């Protein structure tokens, strides 16, 4: 006779990714660093396995007034933090409309809030075939309806055809639906929708919004934004959210976790776009309440970091440290993609993000075999996720070789 | 037609504390520090009106390795953080049975989680007449039923009689209920239930728990624990939670916000107490699923701060600093109570907390006059809340005299 309510009763299951990383660390503890290829979890590590913490982020925290760490942030976050999020996130491609950013605990807080506020119980969140688990978990936490569509065509492009069928089905069922896209730099695939795949996406939603009884919410998860190109090309798609119908709402989920190596500081934002002023003020009012009821207010130090980072002398230093980081990951991926070509290993085309993905049918058998050799990766029904963000350049050719051996027999 | 759902739409007006607080700052701007008595918000300020950030707390953050700040915290919180929460919170008074702690974004995190997991939709949260507003807000967010009972008797002791009839009413309309008690150091009143008053409560809920069709959850908000006695006497009541029937669960909402002057770091915990091992594991599973969906994980630096504060050499310094902070606060309450007596001002007996409370029915009218004299406090239907944590000893007499005059004329 459970004490918890049904919606809050969870029949466990082991934390798989938690288990794998435990094994990886144990292996490092037994065999030593260079013997292990630790590619489980999604955190940027230097070639020596140490977690990267950008000096141009943490030098600010060291320098910061005690009071800017101690005091409460406002419910919605610092007035300047809100403004800098919008400036930073969209760069030179801010969409035309009413835009507001409210602070959240990382990107997670933003995603949760969208799903809570813009979907009712029966209503569906339509998501891609390969996805970050918490999306489903959030739906299930709040009794919203998680629903997947096949991500890729046979050629590994956006399966826009099947995307349409799944949206059509959503609108056939509910007068309110939501569509979640995790791009650019999709976890787990590494895929990014092309600027022209985004065109096809937003043109179709505008079509479906014609029926003004329908309300549609697009949730874009951009956590990996700064890791999907030179910082400009991957922001270009934002312009396509300009002047959308009133019943087509966009919520971007911003996070400092990845872009600022500030995972443990839990600082992101939900950013809403609307061609209506009352819709956005309603966005603000709804999430202000949720913030007050769930976390109260964000990590103040982190918001102030982002503010101090927008200062000219600091902005410059951060820009280079980012470019350097951005590059380290990219050439790691370029070794990977080049090796995969040599070793005839089929992989979802890499466009950005912390991971490369190998589609397979024996995903759990293959990790089993690899773990015997001290190579650690994450399996799933779809295939193997490889945390390229954790493995230095030299260990990658071995990784791809042993990966292809087990995947192709 | 709103974009947000019925539950997420908030036709809600002005933020009252916010506004009062802006007014105070604008006044300080116009007339200057000494001319103004800013007794609005619950933050420990020194005699100069500036926030208090305990060196023993923030030195640890200063000396901490970046990796401990930057990296993700485990869902539940660091293994040692969870343990050290339980030890620190209960002191020598740890109740018997199974106990688990789960990191939350401040105390707010712990409270909402309890309300989500242990009340369903029709279900009542029975809370005292004078309450911190977000309790009601959370119920409304999640569709739980907020329900009040008259806190005090005419002599200003816990209204055990009315409390009983309120709980009786819950257990008559629903198979599942919850009691919320913010003690010791109740915001707004400053009241603490005595040990025998707690006895009267647990003994009564034990009687209700005899009906094994009914499930009851006691939520205790102990944010101001360290500011409600000499450290020891105020914790004694925790022993009353030992060996409670399977169907009487207890969630204690712990916070570093006040005790560690760490509000903007957002770090608390939800600590559960049960005689059943599976009730606890069920609790662990539920709050971990909630954490994953709502905030992903806690502010890692803050958890490590608590761990590092546990080192004997790092502990001595912190206690001696907490004693002063606690003693600076109490002697402010002494000056208040001494003045209130001599100015003939009826006030709810103060036992601990950040606020002293003047009961009155003209509270909104009184604070109009008071603001004209640069005296800022928070009005409610019940009276005036004086944030004694904000104002310095030497100003209290004036604040009390002028408070008495408008309350008594
Ligand atoms: C797609 C995606 N969104 C969000 C997050 C996490 O965001 P945050 O740490 O800011 O809560 C991650 C997890 O690493 C992710 O892969
Ligand atoms: C009764 C009570 N509980 C909880 C809190 C806040 O806890 P936290 O800031 O850690 O979320 C406060 C608000 O200041 C409070 O007065």
């Amino acid at each position: 006779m459970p004490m918890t309510i049904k919606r809050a009763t969870w029949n466990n299951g082991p934390d798989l990714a938690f288990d794998i990383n435990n094994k990886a660390n144990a292996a490092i503890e037994k065999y030593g660093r260079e013997a292990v290829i630790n590619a489980a979890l999604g955190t940027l590590l230097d070639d020596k396995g140490k977690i990267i913490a950008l000096p141009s982020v943490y030098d600010r925290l060291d320098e910061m007034d005690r009071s800017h760490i101690a005091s409460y942030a406002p419910i919605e976050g610092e007035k300047d933090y809100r403004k800098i999020v919008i400036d930073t996130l969209f760069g030179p491609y801010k969409p035309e409309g009413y835009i507001s950013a409210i602070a959240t605990p990382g990107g997670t807080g933003a995603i949760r809030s969208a799903i809570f506020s813009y979907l009712d119980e029966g209503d569906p969140l339509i998501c891609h075939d390969y996805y970050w688990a918490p999306y489903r978990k959030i739906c299930e936490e709040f009794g919203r309806n998680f629903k997947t569509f096949e991500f890729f065509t046979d050629d590994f492009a956006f399966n826009i055809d099947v995307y349409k069928e799944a949206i059509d089905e959503g609108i056939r069922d509910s007068d309110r639906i939501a569509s979640l896209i995790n791009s650019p730099g999709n976890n787990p695939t590494g895929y990014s929708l092309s600027d022209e795949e985004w065109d096809e996406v937003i043109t179709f939603l505008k079509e479906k919004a014609e029926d003004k009884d329908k309300k549609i919410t697009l949730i874009v998860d951009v956590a990996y934004l700064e890791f999907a190109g030179d910082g400009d090309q991957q922001r270009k798609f934002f312009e396509k959210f300009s002047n959308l119908p009133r019943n087509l709402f966009v919520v971007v989920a911003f996070s400092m976790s990845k872009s600022h190596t500030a995972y443990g500081l839990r600082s992101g934002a939900a950013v809403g776009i609307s061609s209506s002023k009352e819709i956005i003020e309603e966005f603000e009012a709804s999430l202000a309440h949720s913030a007050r009821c769930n976390w109260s207010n964000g990590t103040h130090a982190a918001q102030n970091i982002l503010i101090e980072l927008e200062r000219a002398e600091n902005k410059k230093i951060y820009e280079q440290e980012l470019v350097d980081l951005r590059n380290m990951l990219k050439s790691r991926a370029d070794v990977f993609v080049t090796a995969a070509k040599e070793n005839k290993l089929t992989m979802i085309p890499y466009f950005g993000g912390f991971f490369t993905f190998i589609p397979t049918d024996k995903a759990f058998d293959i990790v089993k075999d690899l773990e015997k050799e001290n190579i650690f990766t994450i399996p799933s029904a779809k295939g193997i996720r490889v945390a390229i963000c954790g493995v230095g350049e030299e260990k990658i050719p071995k990784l791809v070789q042993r990966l292809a051996f087990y995947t192709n027999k």
Side-chain angles (χ1 to χ4, degrees), chain A:
Chain A
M1 314 315 102
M3 274 301 309
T4 50
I5 68 157
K6 299 281 186 169
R7 284 275 179 85
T9 298
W10 308 105
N11 296 307
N12 269 34
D15 199 320
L16 185 63
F18 183 82
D19 291 339
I20 315 284
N21 175 55
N22 280 334
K23 284 171 169 183
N25 282 356
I28 295 175
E29 195 63 14
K30 181 172 268 188
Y31 304 100
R33 286 198 297 104
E34 29 271 315
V36 192
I37 301 164
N38 180 18
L41 309 180
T43 307
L44 285 172
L45 308 168
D46 63 38
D47 286 26
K48 308 270 194 181
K50 192 174 182 185
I51 176 188
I52 295 290
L54 293 171
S56 73
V57 164
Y58 297 92
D59 280 343
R60 306 305 139 240
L61 179 66
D62 291 324
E63 289 173 353
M64 194 170 291
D65 211 315
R66 242 84 178 268
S67 55
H68 290 85
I69 307 167
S71 62
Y72 283 119
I75 309 311
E76 296 98 320
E78 279 302 321
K79 180 194 177 68
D80 284 331
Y81 172 72
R82 299 170 71 170
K83 191 183 183 307
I84 295 154
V85 172
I86 300 161
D87 288 340
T88 308
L89 166 69
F90 301 120
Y93 297 113
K94 182 150 82 163
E96 270 209 315
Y98 298 90
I99 299 170
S100 187
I102 85 104
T104 51
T108 306
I111 278 137
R112 171 229 168 263
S113 294
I115 298 172
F116 184 64
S117 293
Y118 298 98
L119 284 165
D120 223 286
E121 289 225 338
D123 308 349
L125 173 84
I126 295 128
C127 188
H128 36 79
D129 227 8
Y130 310 53
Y131 62 91
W132 188 49
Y135 301 140
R136 195 190 83 255
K137 301 255 197 71
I138 290 167
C139 287
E140 292 186 23
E141 175 91 356
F142 300 125
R144 272 64 171 170
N145 208 313
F146 192 72
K147 195 170 271 56
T148 57
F149 70 88
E150 278 163 55
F151 211 161
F152 305 111
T153 64
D154 280 2
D155 276 4
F156 289 112
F158 196 79
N159 196 353
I160 190 71
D161 278 6
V162 176
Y163 175 75
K164 286 174 185 183
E165 280 162 31
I167 297 292
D168 280 347
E169 194 170 51
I171 271 145
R172 196 246 279 121
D173 282 12
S174 280
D175 285 330
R176 157 182 271 112
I177 67 146
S179 169
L180 203 152
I181 317 288
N182 175 218
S183 175
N186 183 77
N187 181 10
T189 67
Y191 188 74
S192 298
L193 281 67
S194 64
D195 294 340
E196 34 252 324
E197 275 167 348
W198 267 120
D199 261 320
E200 296 185 305
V201 163
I202 64 92
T203 303
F204 188 72
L205 298 187
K206 292 170 85 165
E207 218 166 79
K208 300 271 92 195
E210 286 181 320
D211 188 321
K212 290 263 277 163
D213 291 322
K214 304 295 166 184
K215 293 185 191 289
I216 312 162
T217 318
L218 181 78
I219 303 154
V220 193
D221 189 349
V222 299
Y224 299 96
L225 182 62
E226 300 276 29
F227 299 100
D230 55 25
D232 198 288
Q233 186 152 20
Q234 67 260 48
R235 280 182 168 85
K236 180 168 265 202
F237 86 100
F238 282 134
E239 268 177 320
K240 307 182 182 291
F241 298 152
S242 299
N243 311 320
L244 299 173
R246 209 149 282 188
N247 54 334
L248 185 65
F249 198 43
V250 188
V251 176
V252 189
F254 173 88
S255 173
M256 284 175 68
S257 289
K258 282 80 190 165
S259 66
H260 292 69
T261 61
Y263 325 86
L265 278 171
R266 317 301 312 120
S267 174
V271 188
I273 325 285
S274 204
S275 64
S276 170
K277 195 184 170 206
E278 51 216 314
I279 295 293
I280 195 90
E281 285 164 345
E282 164 200 283
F283 168 79
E284 294 177 327
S286 187
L287 269 86
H289 192 277
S290 296
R292 196 52 207 282
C293 296
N294 286 258
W295 51 86
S296 211
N297 33 82
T299 311
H300 201 192
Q303 297 179 19
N304 289 318
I305 295 165
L306 201 73
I307 292 169
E308 287 302 315
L309 279 180
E310 200 68 9
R311 306 275 280 275
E313 78 275 347
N314 294 324
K315 180 139 194 140
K316 268 187 188 177
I317 308 283
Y318 171 78
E319 292 293 329
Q320 184 55 23
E321 288 188 22
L322 183 54
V323 166
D324 280 4
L325 186 67
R326 205 180 263 150
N327 286 339
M328 183 216 290
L329 186 67
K330 193 181 82 82
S331 16
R332 276 183 186 177
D334 286 333
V335 167
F336 192 103
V337 178
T338 288
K341 189 176 141 91
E342 195 80 2
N343 286 280
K344 304 130 139 282
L345 176 74
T346 305
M347 58 166 290
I348 287 170
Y350 176 84
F351 286 92
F354 279 18
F355 314 100
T356 55
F357 193 92
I358 288 90
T360 174
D361 225 14
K362 320 167 165 182
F364 284 74
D365 201 59
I366 301 162
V367 51
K368 214 181 226 175
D369 280 314
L370 293 162
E371 285 193 6
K372 281 183 185 78
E373 289 173 17
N374 297 308
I375 292 167
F376 300 93
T377 47
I378 317 297
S380 76
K382 290 303 201 300
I384 310 167
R385 194 188 72 172
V386 183
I388 209 73
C389 63
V391 304
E393 225 165 274
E394 54 270 83
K395 286 179 197 184
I396 306 181
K398 178 161 56 97
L399 171 75
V400 172
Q401 286 164 353
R402 304 269 74 219
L403 218 32
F405 177 90
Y406 290 112
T407 315
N408 301 326
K409 76 165 157 76

